[PDB]
Protein backbone atom coordinates (compact mmCIF):
# COMPACT_ATOMS: atom_id res chain seq x y z
CA UNK A 1 0.00 0.00 0.00
CA UNK A 2 1.26 3.44 -0.91
CA UNK A 3 1.46 6.08 1.84
CA UNK A 4 -0.80 9.10 1.76
CA UNK A 5 1.30 12.16 2.63
CA UNK A 6 -0.42 15.25 4.01
CA UNK A 7 0.72 18.84 4.39
CA UNK A 8 -1.19 20.13 7.45
CA UNK A 9 -0.70 23.85 6.75
CA UNK A 10 -2.00 23.69 3.15
CA UNK A 11 -4.38 20.72 3.43
CA UNK A 12 -2.79 19.19 0.31
CA UNK A 13 -2.14 15.45 -0.09
CA UNK A 14 0.30 13.38 -2.19
CA UNK A 15 0.99 9.64 -2.53
CA UNK A 16 4.50 8.24 -2.25
CA UNK A 17 5.10 5.63 -4.97
CA UNK A 18 8.87 6.01 -4.95
CA UNK A 19 9.15 4.00 -1.69
CA UNK A 20 8.34 0.92 -3.80
CA UNK A 21 11.90 1.23 -5.29
CA UNK A 22 13.40 0.58 -1.79
CA UNK A 23 15.50 -2.64 -1.61
CA UNK A 24 16.97 -2.14 1.88
CA UNK A 25 15.19 -2.28 5.23
CA UNK A 26 15.14 0.62 7.69
CA UNK A 27 14.89 0.05 11.50
CA UNK A 28 11.08 0.09 11.89
CA UNK A 29 8.53 -2.77 12.10
CA UNK A 30 4.70 -2.79 12.56
CA UNK A 31 5.23 -3.46 16.32
CA UNK A 32 7.50 -0.39 16.96
CA UNK A 33 8.77 2.74 15.21
CA UNK A 34 12.56 3.40 15.49
CA UNK A 35 12.58 6.53 13.26
CA UNK A 36 14.24 8.69 15.99
CA UNK A 37 17.35 6.44 16.29
CA UNK A 38 20.49 8.19 14.92
CA UNK A 39 22.40 5.00 13.94
CA UNK A 40 21.31 1.57 12.56
CA UNK A 41 21.46 -1.04 15.34
CA UNK A 42 23.01 -3.53 12.92
CA UNK A 43 26.00 -1.25 12.04
CA UNK A 44 27.85 -13.21 -3.22
CA UNK A 45 28.10 -12.39 -6.95
CA UNK A 46 24.40 -12.66 -7.87
CA UNK A 47 23.43 -9.99 -5.32
CA UNK A 48 26.25 -7.70 -6.49
CA UNK A 49 25.17 -8.37 -10.08
CA UNK A 50 21.55 -7.37 -9.42
CA UNK A 51 22.60 -4.10 -7.70
CA UNK A 52 25.06 -3.43 -10.54
CA UNK A 53 22.36 -4.06 -13.21
CA UNK A 54 19.78 -1.94 -11.37
CA UNK A 55 22.31 0.93 -11.21
CA UNK A 56 23.35 0.64 -14.87
CA UNK A 57 19.63 0.79 -15.81
CA UNK A 58 19.26 3.87 -13.62
CA UNK A 59 22.16 5.49 -15.49
CA UNK A 60 20.98 4.76 -19.04
CA UNK A 61 17.48 5.79 -18.16
CA UNK A 62 18.88 9.16 -16.87
CA UNK A 63 20.60 9.89 -20.23
CA UNK A 64 17.41 8.76 -22.03
CA UNK A 65 19.34 5.88 -23.70
CA UNK A 66 17.41 3.04 -22.06
CA UNK A 67 17.59 -0.13 -24.18
CA UNK A 68 20.24 1.26 -26.53
CA UNK A 69 23.12 -0.79 -27.85
CA UNK A 70 25.36 1.30 -25.58
CA UNK A 71 23.14 0.14 -22.69
CA UNK A 72 23.15 -3.59 -23.51
CA UNK A 73 26.93 -3.65 -24.11
CA UNK A 74 27.56 -1.93 -20.81
CA UNK A 75 25.48 -4.54 -18.94
CA UNK A 76 27.46 -7.30 -20.65
CA UNK A 77 30.73 -5.64 -19.60
CA UNK A 78 29.53 -5.46 -16.00
CA UNK A 79 28.30 -9.06 -16.15
CA UNK A 80 31.52 -10.36 -17.76
CA UNK A 81 33.63 -8.55 -15.13
CA UNK A 82 31.68 -9.66 -12.05
CA UNK A 83 31.60 -13.29 -13.26
CA UNK A 84 35.38 -13.48 -13.76
CA UNK A 85 36.59 -11.30 -10.88
CA UNK A 86 33.69 -10.96 -8.35
CA UNK A 87 33.65 -7.22 -8.88
CA UNK A 88 33.57 -4.42 -11.47
CA UNK A 89 34.46 -0.78 -12.05
CA UNK A 90 32.40 2.25 -12.87
CA UNK A 91 32.97 4.61 -15.78
CA UNK A 92 33.63 8.20 -14.61
CA UNK A 93 30.27 9.40 -16.01
CA UNK A 94 28.49 6.61 -14.01
CA UNK A 95 30.37 7.62 -10.89
CA UNK A 96 29.34 11.26 -11.43
CA UNK A 97 25.71 10.21 -11.92
CA UNK A 98 25.90 7.85 -8.90
CA UNK A 99 27.25 10.47 -6.51
CA UNK A 100 24.58 13.12 -7.36
CA UNK A 101 21.97 10.35 -6.90
CA UNK A 102 23.31 9.38 -3.43
CA UNK A 103 22.96 13.01 -2.39
CA UNK A 104 19.50 13.23 -3.96
CA UNK A 105 18.53 10.09 -2.06
CA UNK A 106 19.90 11.24 1.39
CA UNK A 107 16.79 11.48 3.69
CA UNK A 108 18.48 13.65 6.35
CA UNK A 109 19.66 16.36 3.95
CA UNK A 110 17.64 19.60 3.80
CA UNK A 111 19.96 21.02 1.09
CA UNK A 112 18.83 18.66 -1.69
CA UNK A 113 17.40 21.38 -3.96
CA UNK A 114 21.05 21.70 -5.05
CA UNK A 115 21.55 18.00 -5.82
CA UNK A 116 22.23 18.38 -9.56
CA UNK A 117 25.03 20.90 -8.87
CA UNK A 118 27.86 18.81 -7.50
CA UNK A 119 31.50 18.87 -8.55
CA UNK A 120 32.77 15.29 -8.61
CA UNK A 121 36.53 14.71 -8.28
CA UNK A 122 37.50 11.20 -9.36
CA UNK A 123 40.35 10.17 -7.07
CA UNK A 124 40.17 6.42 -7.75
CA UNK A 125 43.75 6.49 -9.03
CA UNK A 126 45.02 7.34 -5.58
CA UNK A 127 47.67 4.90 -4.22
CA UNK A 128 48.99 6.38 -0.94
CA UNK A 129 48.01 8.55 2.02
CA UNK A 130 50.25 11.28 0.54
CA UNK A 131 48.18 11.35 -2.68
CA UNK A 132 44.94 11.37 -0.64
CA UNK A 133 46.19 14.49 1.09
CA UNK A 134 46.84 16.27 -2.22
CA UNK A 135 43.37 15.41 -3.43
CA UNK A 136 41.87 16.60 -0.10
CA UNK A 137 43.67 19.99 -0.37
CA UNK A 138 42.45 20.52 -3.92
CA UNK A 139 38.90 19.67 -2.81
CA UNK A 140 39.07 22.21 0.05
CA UNK A 141 40.51 24.83 -2.29
CA UNK A 142 37.88 24.22 -4.89
CA UNK A 143 34.92 23.94 -2.52
CA UNK A 144 35.91 27.03 -0.46
CA UNK A 145 36.50 29.28 -3.47
CA UNK A 146 37.32 32.35 -1.36
CA UNK A 147 33.96 32.14 0.47
CA UNK A 148 31.83 31.48 -2.58
CA UNK A 149 31.26 27.89 -1.54
CA UNK A 150 30.65 25.20 -4.18
CA UNK A 151 29.37 21.67 -3.45
CA UNK A 152 31.92 18.93 -4.07
CA UNK A 153 32.76 15.26 -3.55
CA UNK A 154 36.09 13.47 -3.95
CA UNK A 155 35.86 9.71 -4.48
CA UNK A 156 38.85 7.57 -3.42
CA UNK A 157 39.36 3.93 -4.55
CA UNK A 158 36.56 1.51 -3.80
CA UNK A 159 36.74 -1.29 -1.25
CA UNK A 160 38.19 -4.51 -2.60
CA UNK A 161 37.68 -8.05 -1.11
CA UNK A 162 41.41 -8.77 -0.68
CA UNK A 163 42.46 -5.74 1.43
CA UNK A 164 41.99 -2.88 3.89
CA UNK A 165 40.00 0.26 3.07
CA UNK A 166 41.13 3.72 2.14
CA UNK A 167 39.78 5.82 5.06
CA UNK A 168 39.89 9.33 6.37
CA UNK A 169 39.81 8.86 10.13
CA UNK A 170 38.39 12.36 10.84
CA UNK A 171 34.61 12.73 10.75
CA UNK A 172 34.92 16.03 8.87
CA UNK A 173 37.85 17.49 6.93
CA UNK A 174 37.77 20.55 9.25
CA UNK A 175 37.19 19.84 12.99
CA UNK A 176 38.29 21.66 16.18
CA UNK A 177 40.37 19.83 18.76
CA UNK A 178 38.86 18.84 22.10
CA UNK A 179 41.37 18.44 24.93
CA UNK A 180 40.22 16.39 27.94
CA UNK A 181 41.22 18.05 31.25
CA UNK A 182 42.57 16.18 34.30
CA UNK A 183 39.49 17.63 36.05
CA UNK A 184 37.04 15.97 33.63
CA UNK A 185 36.03 19.04 31.55
CA UNK A 186 36.96 19.65 27.88
CA UNK A 187 38.76 22.57 26.21
CA UNK A 188 37.57 22.92 22.59
CA UNK A 189 34.92 20.73 20.95
CA UNK A 190 33.86 17.83 23.24
CA UNK A 191 32.64 15.93 20.16
CA UNK A 192 36.29 15.59 19.01
CA UNK A 193 38.03 14.33 22.18
CA UNK A 194 38.63 10.87 20.69
CA UNK A 195 40.00 11.99 17.29
CA UNK A 196 42.12 14.65 19.06
CA UNK A 197 43.71 11.93 21.23
CA UNK A 198 44.29 9.66 18.20
CA UNK A 199 46.09 12.56 16.48
CA UNK A 200 48.40 13.28 19.44
CA UNK A 201 49.11 9.57 19.79
CA UNK A 202 50.08 9.41 16.10
CA UNK A 203 52.59 12.25 16.54
CA UNK A 204 50.69 15.55 16.43
CA UNK A 205 52.00 18.29 18.73
CA UNK A 206 48.70 19.53 20.22
CA UNK A 207 47.66 23.14 20.72
CA UNK A 208 45.83 24.41 23.78
CA UNK A 209 43.08 26.65 22.40
CA UNK A 210 39.29 26.45 22.00
CA UNK A 211 39.41 26.38 18.20
CA UNK A 212 42.58 24.48 17.12
CA UNK A 213 42.01 22.97 13.62
CA UNK A 214 42.84 19.27 13.66
CA UNK A 215 45.36 17.59 11.36
CA UNK A 216 44.06 14.75 9.13
CA UNK A 217 44.69 11.06 9.74
CA UNK A 218 44.64 9.48 6.28
CA UNK A 219 44.86 5.74 5.81
CA UNK A 220 45.91 3.83 2.69
CA UNK A 221 45.00 0.08 2.72
CA UNK A 222 46.56 -2.03 5.52
CA UNK A 223 48.92 0.80 6.56
CA UNK A 224 48.94 2.78 9.76
CA UNK A 225 47.26 6.15 9.15
CA UNK A 226 49.49 9.16 8.43
CA UNK A 227 49.21 12.65 9.92
CA UNK A 228 48.83 15.70 7.65
CA UNK A 229 48.50 19.29 8.85
CA UNK A 230 46.17 21.37 6.67
CA UNK A 231 47.87 24.60 5.51
CA UNK A 232 46.13 27.34 7.54
CA UNK A 233 45.50 29.38 4.39
CA UNK A 234 43.37 26.49 3.17
CA UNK A 235 40.94 26.60 6.09
CA UNK A 236 38.71 29.67 5.86
CA UNK A 237 37.21 30.66 9.20
CA UNK A 238 34.66 33.31 10.16
CA UNK A 239 35.11 35.28 13.46
CA UNK A 240 31.71 35.63 15.13
CA UNK A 241 30.25 39.03 15.97
CA UNK A 242 26.68 40.34 16.52
CA UNK A 243 25.06 43.17 14.51
CA UNK A 244 24.13 45.12 17.67
CA UNK A 245 25.59 43.48 20.81
CA UNK A 246 29.19 44.73 20.88
CA UNK A 247 30.40 42.48 23.71
CA UNK A 248 29.59 39.44 21.52
CA UNK A 249 32.86 39.58 19.55
CA UNK A 250 34.68 39.62 22.89
CA UNK A 251 33.55 36.01 23.35
CA UNK A 252 36.31 34.97 20.86
CA UNK A 253 33.94 32.66 18.99
CA UNK A 254 34.55 31.53 15.39
CA UNK A 255 33.57 28.68 13.08
CA UNK A 256 34.97 27.27 9.81
CA UNK A 257 33.35 27.94 6.42
CA UNK A 258 33.35 24.43 5.01
CA UNK A 259 31.20 21.53 6.21
CA UNK A 260 32.85 18.47 4.72
CA UNK A 261 31.77 14.99 5.88
CA UNK A 262 34.59 12.46 5.56
CA UNK A 263 33.60 9.31 7.55
CA UNK A 264 30.62 8.14 5.46
CA UNK A 265 30.57 5.31 2.88
CA UNK A 266 29.35 5.95 -0.67
CA UNK A 267 27.50 2.98 -2.21
CA UNK A 268 26.89 2.93 -5.97
CA UNK A 269 25.67 -0.19 -7.79
CA UNK A 270 26.85 -2.48 -5.04
CA UNK A 271 30.34 -0.95 -5.08
CA UNK A 272 31.47 0.75 -1.89
CA UNK A 273 33.60 3.83 -1.54
CA UNK A 274 34.87 4.00 2.05
CA UNK A 275 36.58 7.38 1.57
CA UNK A 276 34.51 9.89 -0.38
CA UNK A 277 34.40 13.17 1.48
CA UNK A 278 31.71 15.58 0.43
CA UNK A 279 30.91 19.18 1.23
CA UNK A 280 28.35 21.94 0.68
CA UNK A 281 27.77 25.05 2.78
CA UNK A 282 26.29 25.43 6.27
CA UNK A 283 22.77 26.08 7.36
CA UNK A 284 23.20 28.59 10.20
CA UNK A 285 21.49 26.47 12.92
CA UNK A 286 24.11 23.73 12.59
CA UNK A 287 26.61 26.24 13.97
CA UNK A 288 24.43 28.67 15.96
CA UNK A 289 22.23 26.10 17.65
CA UNK A 290 23.88 22.65 17.65
CA UNK A 291 27.64 23.20 17.55
CA UNK A 292 27.64 26.21 19.87
CA UNK A 293 24.60 25.57 22.16
CA UNK A 294 24.33 21.75 22.53
CA UNK A 295 25.12 20.96 26.16
CA UNK A 296 27.61 18.29 25.04
CA UNK A 297 29.27 20.70 22.55
CA UNK A 298 30.59 24.26 23.18
CA UNK A 299 27.55 24.80 25.39
CA UNK A 300 27.73 28.73 25.36
CA UNK A 301 24.07 29.51 26.20
CA UNK A 302 24.71 30.43 29.83
CA UNK A 303 27.68 32.69 28.95
CA UNK A 304 25.63 34.50 26.34
CA UNK A 305 22.60 34.81 28.68
CA UNK A 306 24.73 36.26 31.49
CA UNK A 307 26.16 38.73 28.98
CA UNK A 308 22.66 39.76 27.84
CA UNK A 309 21.80 40.31 31.51
CA UNK A 310 18.98 37.71 31.41
CA UNK A 311 17.39 36.01 34.40
CA UNK A 312 19.13 32.68 34.48
CA UNK A 313 17.41 31.44 37.62
CA UNK A 314 14.21 30.30 35.97
CA UNK A 315 13.40 28.46 32.75
CA UNK A 316 10.18 30.47 32.37
CA UNK A 317 12.16 33.68 31.56
CA UNK A 318 13.02 31.82 28.28
CA UNK A 319 16.62 32.96 28.66
CA UNK A 320 17.78 29.92 26.70
CA UNK A 321 15.52 30.69 23.75
CA UNK A 322 16.49 34.36 23.75
CA UNK A 323 20.22 33.65 23.87
CA UNK A 324 19.98 31.01 21.14
CA UNK A 325 18.26 33.42 18.75
CA UNK A 326 20.97 36.03 19.15
CA UNK A 327 23.68 33.39 18.66
CA UNK A 328 22.06 32.26 15.42
CA UNK A 329 21.74 35.90 14.37
CA UNK A 330 25.46 36.39 15.09
CA UNK A 331 26.37 33.44 12.84
CA UNK A 332 24.23 34.72 9.95
CA UNK A 333 25.56 38.30 10.29
CA UNK A 334 29.18 37.21 10.58
CA UNK A 335 29.03 34.85 7.59
CA UNK A 336 27.29 37.58 5.50
CA UNK A 337 29.88 40.19 6.49
CA UNK A 338 32.75 37.82 5.70
CA UNK A 339 31.05 37.06 2.35
CA UNK A 340 30.90 33.32 3.07
CA UNK A 341 27.97 31.24 1.79
CA UNK A 342 25.44 30.30 4.46
CA UNK A 343 21.70 29.75 4.39
CA UNK A 344 19.31 30.37 7.29
CA UNK A 345 16.81 27.68 8.37
CA UNK A 346 13.80 29.57 6.92
CA UNK A 347 15.31 29.91 3.46
CA UNK A 348 16.64 26.31 3.59
CA UNK A 349 13.30 24.74 4.54
CA UNK A 350 11.43 26.84 1.93
CA UNK A 351 13.90 25.51 -0.68
CA UNK A 352 13.34 21.95 0.62
CA UNK A 353 9.56 22.28 0.17
CA UNK A 354 10.15 23.29 -3.44
CA UNK A 355 12.47 20.25 -3.68
CA UNK A 356 9.68 17.92 -2.37
CA UNK A 357 7.41 19.30 -5.07
CA UNK A 358 10.05 18.88 -7.84
CA UNK A 359 10.71 15.32 -6.69
CA UNK A 360 7.00 14.45 -6.50
CA UNK A 361 6.74 15.34 -10.16
CA UNK A 362 10.02 13.71 -11.25
CA UNK A 363 9.97 10.50 -9.22
CA UNK A 364 6.63 10.24 -7.37
CA UNK A 365 8.17 10.82 -3.94
CA UNK A 366 11.11 11.92 -1.85
CA UNK A 367 12.64 10.05 1.12
CA UNK A 368 12.97 12.44 4.09
CA UNK A 369 13.70 12.09 7.79
CA UNK A 370 11.38 14.52 9.52
CA UNK A 371 13.39 14.64 12.80
CA UNK A 372 16.47 15.77 10.80
CA UNK A 373 14.81 18.06 8.22
CA UNK A 374 13.00 20.14 10.84
CA UNK A 375 15.55 22.61 12.27
CA UNK A 376 16.55 22.50 16.00
CA UNK A 377 15.08 25.96 16.80
CA UNK A 378 11.79 27.41 15.57
CA UNK A 379 10.57 24.05 14.21
CA UNK A 380 6.93 24.93 13.62
CA UNK A 381 7.82 28.40 12.30
CA UNK A 382 9.18 26.55 9.21
CA UNK A 383 6.96 24.89 6.53
CA UNK A 384 8.65 21.45 6.85
CA UNK A 385 7.24 21.00 10.44
CA UNK A 386 3.75 20.77 8.93
CA UNK A 387 4.76 18.40 6.17
CA UNK A 388 4.40 14.63 6.55
CA UNK A 389 7.43 12.73 5.28
CA UNK A 390 8.14 9.09 4.40
CA UNK A 391 11.58 7.74 5.20
CA UNK A 392 13.17 4.89 3.23
CA UNK A 393 16.50 3.84 1.79
CA UNK A 394 17.19 4.21 -1.94
CA UNK A 395 20.47 3.36 -3.62
CA UNK A 396 22.89 5.03 -4.53
CA UNK A 397 23.25 5.98 -0.87
CA UNK A 398 25.54 7.55 1.68
CA UNK A 399 25.82 5.19 4.68
CA UNK A 400 27.43 5.08 8.08
CA UNK A 401 30.38 2.68 8.51
CA UNK A 402 32.48 1.53 11.51
CA UNK A 403 35.29 3.70 12.85
CA UNK A 404 38.56 2.33 11.47
CA UNK A 405 40.40 2.08 14.83
Ligand X SMILES: C[C@H](O)[C@H](O)[C@H]1CNc2nc(N)[nH]c(=O)c2N1
Ligand Y SMILES: Cc1cc(N)nc(COC[C@@H](CN)OCc2cc(C)cc(N)n2)c1
Give catalytic residues, as residue numbers.
109, 112, 281, 286
Residues that bind ligand X (CB under 6 A): 8, 36, 38, 371-372, 385-388
| Cβ(396)–Cβ(105) below 8 Å | yes
Residues that bind ligand HEM (CB under 6 A): 103, 106, 108-111, 114, 118, 151, 153, 278, 280-281, 283, 286, 343, 348, 372, 398
The answer to the question of whether 371 is labelled as a binding residue is yes
The answer to the question of whether 179 is labelled as a binding residue is no
Could you tell me how many residues of this chain bind Zn ion (CB under 5 A)?
Answer: 3
Enter the DSSP assignment of 387: B
Max alpha carbon distance in the chain (Å)?
Answer: 73
What lies within 8 Å, CB to CB, of 197 at 6+ separation is 180
| Cβ(54)–Cβ(269) below 8 Å | yes
Nearer to ligand X, 268 or 331 (CB): 331
Compose the 10-29 pattern: x for residues touching its own copies by CB under 8 A, - for all others.
Answer: xx----x--x--x--xxxxx
**366 SS3 class:** coil
Residue from 228, 282, 298, 392 that binds ligand Y (CB under 6 A)? 282
Which residues in 111-124 are b (16+ Cβ under 10 Å) and which e? Answer: bbbbbeebbbbbbb
Nearer to ligand X, 101 or 291 (CB): 291
Bridging pattern class, strands 119-122 and 152-155: parallel
What lies within 8 Å, CB to CB, of 205 at 6+ separation is none
Compose the 278-317 pattern: x for residues touching its own copies by CB under 8 A, - for all others.
Answer: ------x----xx--xxxx----x-------------xxx
The answer to the question of whether 299 is labelled as a binding residue is no
Compose the 283-322 pattern: x for residues touching ligand Y by CB under 6 A, - for all others.
Answer: x--x------------------------------------
Straight-line distance from the first to the last Cα atom of the chain, in angstroms, rounded to the nearest whole number: 43
The item of ligand HEM, Zn ion, its own copies, none sharing an interface with residue 231, based on CB under 5 to 8 Å by kind, is: none
Closest Cα partner for 172 from 288, 256, 289, 296?
256
Using the Cα atoms of residue 91, residue 93, residue 94 and residue 100 in order, give the sign of their dihedral: positive
Smallest gap, in angstroms, from Cβ of residue 33 to ligand Y?
Answer: 17
Cα atoms found within 13 Å of the Cα of residue 61, Cβ hemisphere only: 10
Compose the 190-209 pattern: x for residues touching ligand Y by CB under 6 A, - for all others.
Answer: -x------------------
Residue positions in the annotated binding site for Zn(2+)?
A: 28, 33
Residue positions in the annotated binding site for heme b?
A: 109, 400
Residue positions in the annotated binding site?
A: 28, 33, 36, 109, 172, 281-282, 286, 291, 371-372, 385, 400
Amino acid sequence: KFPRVKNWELGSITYDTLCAQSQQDGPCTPRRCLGSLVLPRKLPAEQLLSQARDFINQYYSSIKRSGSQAHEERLQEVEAEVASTGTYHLRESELVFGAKQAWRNAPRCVGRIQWGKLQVFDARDCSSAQEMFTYICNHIKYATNRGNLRSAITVFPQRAPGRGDFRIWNSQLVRYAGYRQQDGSVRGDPANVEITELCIQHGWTPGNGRFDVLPLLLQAPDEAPELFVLPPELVLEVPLEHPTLEWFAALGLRWYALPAVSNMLLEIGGLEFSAAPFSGWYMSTEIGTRNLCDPHRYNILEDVAVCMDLDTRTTSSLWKDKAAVEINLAVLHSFQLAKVTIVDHHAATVSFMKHLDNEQKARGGCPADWAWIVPPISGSLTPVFHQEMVNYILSPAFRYQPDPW
